[PDB]
Design a protein around this ligand. Structure first.
Ligand SMILES: CSC[C@H]1O[C@@H](n2cnc3c(N)ncnc32)[C@H](O)[C@@H]1O
Ligand SMILES: [Zn+2]
Ligand SMILES: [Zn+2]
Lengths: 116, 297
């Protein structure tokens, strides 16, 4: 059957409905002089970012549900995700709604300057 | 000047005493350090533990193997594991474990009582934050505790590589005499108190460079009494200072040699290399782990 739980859409809708974001994302101590790239093997927050343990910011990890791809692989766990400080109240929502430029490794619209 | 360190290690002269066990009464009890905005106690604590481990002669081989017990929070995440993975060289194999389910950045996670955990390989570093809050009964005698401590002692003896190190969390009431005795099977040992959690009687018992034999005879009942005596008479000022300087945080990749040797070829020359953090003795095969599952109706 075509049935599949859509947790991404459910979380977005709960956010739009005014729901409190997922908490206890694991924020790291770091220099905040890093590359600012989005998903890295060690914390890379720049001055405008916070660095978090990847698994703790993944909706699928945190909700105990399957990752939406054939192989069920998670590209956050075991890595660190840089979140803009202005968005760090909701790291899970941020990683869910945003995309990584595949050339510069920065977030589209939050550090990627390739389209200039 | 201690406030700018990551924490305070038990001074050698306190290790040499013969104190009787007393109640732990910390002058700075109930004080708290001011953590950086949005930083969890458990991130700050493991950060300071790792900053202190940076000052010891840890063996750091290629393909380093680290296992972390007691890694789950009551929130279902693994803050300590995330700090260990930040700290350890990229590519280090990191396994963590806890009784309750949690999501983790470790390469592999085992859920269940640590007595169910078995590994084929030996390990270069063992970290434990296991703690049972039921031991905090101030109304009955403070005797050596077994449970997970019994497992940890055997796991060190059977699965820690010669040259490897451990950091095992203890408190006033959560401690084990044999674990202290095992500290005498390392080239050096201490009880380390993080500056962010110095209002607590917790410490990490650190064995540095495992030798597989008793280098010194330690009475664990006496040593824990010495540890409490030190804590009772040496207030540690709570401090977050070291958290604000992470420029030298990562563990140095030392390329430490790994060799397979059999008990008859560990001579004084090898023991001295082990003692200096220059040698790891174990096989270099695949890392294979498992959790025993009890099947019932
Ligand atoms: C990080 S706080 C202490 C942690 O130690 C864990 N712990 C305590 N006793 C055991 C045990 N016997 N086996 C595995 N984990 C334990 C607890 O589940 C808790 O998450
Ligand atoms: Zn995930
Ligand atoms: Zn780009």
């Amino acid at each position: 059957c075509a049935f599949a739980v859509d947790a991404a859409k459910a979380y977005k809708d709960y956010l739009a409905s005014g729901g409190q974001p997922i908490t206890n994302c694991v924020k790291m101590l770091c220099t905040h002089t890093g590359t600012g790239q989005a998903i890295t093997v060690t914390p890379e927050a720049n001055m405008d970012q916070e660095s978090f343990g990847g698994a703790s910011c993944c909706l699928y990890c945190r909700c105990h549900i399957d990752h939406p791809n054939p192989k069920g692989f998670c590209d956050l766990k075991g890595k660190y995700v840089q979140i803009p400080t202005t968005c760090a109240n909701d790291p899970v929502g941020f990683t869910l709604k945003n995309t990584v430029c595949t050339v510069c490794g920065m977030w589209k619209g939050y550090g990627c300057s390739c389209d200039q | 000047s201690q406030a700018w360190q990551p924490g305070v290690a038990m001074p050698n002269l306190y290790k040499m005493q013969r104190m009787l066990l007393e109640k732990c009464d910390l002058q700075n009890y109930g004080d708290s350090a001011t953590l950086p905005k949005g930083i969890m106690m458990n991130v700050a604590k493991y950060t300071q533990l790792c900053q202190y481990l940076n000052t010891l002669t840890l063996a750091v081989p290629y393909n380093m193997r680290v296992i972390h017990f007691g890694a789950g929070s009551d929130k279902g995440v693994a803050p300590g594991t995330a700090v260990l993975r930040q700290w350890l060289p990229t590519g280090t194999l990191l396994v963590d474990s806890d009784l309750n389910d949690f999501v983790s950045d470790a390469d592999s996670t085992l859920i269940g009582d640590c007595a169910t955990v078995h590994t084929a390989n030996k390990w270069d570093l063992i970290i434990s934050d296991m703690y049972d809050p039921k031991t905090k009964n101030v109304t009955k005698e403070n005797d050596s505790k077994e449970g997970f401590f019994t497992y940890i002692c055997g796991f060190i003896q059977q699965k820690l590589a010669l040259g490897g190190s451990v950091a095992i969390k203890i408190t006033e009431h959560s401690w084990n005499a044999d674990l202290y005795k095992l500290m005498g099977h390392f080239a050096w040992w201490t009880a380390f108190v993080t500056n962010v959690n110095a209002s607590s009687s917790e410490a990490f018992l650190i064995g540095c460079n495992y030798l597989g034999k008793p280098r010194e005879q330690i009475d664990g009942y006496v040593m824990h009494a010495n540890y409490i005596f030190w804590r009772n008479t040496n207030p540690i000022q709570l401090s977050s200072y070291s958290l604000f300087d992470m420029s030298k945080f990562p563990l140095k990749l030392r390329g430490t040699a790994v060799m397979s040797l059999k008990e008859g070829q560990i001579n004084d020359m090898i023991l001295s290399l082990l003692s200096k953090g220059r040698l790891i003795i174990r096989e270099n095969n695949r890392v294979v782990i498992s959790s025993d599952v009890l099947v019932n109706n």
